[PDB]
């Protein structure tokens, strides 16, 4: 019965609801907090954003090295800073 309103998604939420918010060419993980002020907390700290794509921590993908042509395995490590690595495999 306490709610939040998110102008980016245009939706109204209940305290405790979690949802994705597209903003600044990223996806954010948002939580409706409420706290007597319709507080929303949103974070990209559990994601990586690379190459026009949003990844979650733990995601892995493979792609050729753009110059070398050999295969890479990429991983979203996150670590509070969108840290990804791509390792030749």
């Amino acid at each position: 019965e306490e709610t939040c309103f998110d102008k980016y998604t245009g939706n109204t939420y209940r305290v405790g609801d979690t949802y994705e918010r597209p903003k600044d060419s990223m996806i954010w993980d948002c939580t409706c907090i409420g706290a007597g002020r319709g507080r929303i907390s949103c974070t990209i700290a559990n994601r990586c954003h690379e190459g026009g794509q949003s990844y979650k921590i733990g995601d892995t993908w493979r792609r050729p090295h753009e110059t070398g042509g050999y295969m890479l395995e990429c991983v979203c490590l996150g670590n509070g800073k969108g840290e990804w690595t791509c390792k030749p495999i």
């Binding site: 907090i33 990209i44 990804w84």
Partner: peptide, 18 residues
């Protein structure tokens, strides 16, 4: 080499709005 990237140092990762 292993390629690597991360968010800009000055990008805030967690924000609150009321």
């Amino acid at each position: 080499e292993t390629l690597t990237g991360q968010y800009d140092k000055n990008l805030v990762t967690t924000v609150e709005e009321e």
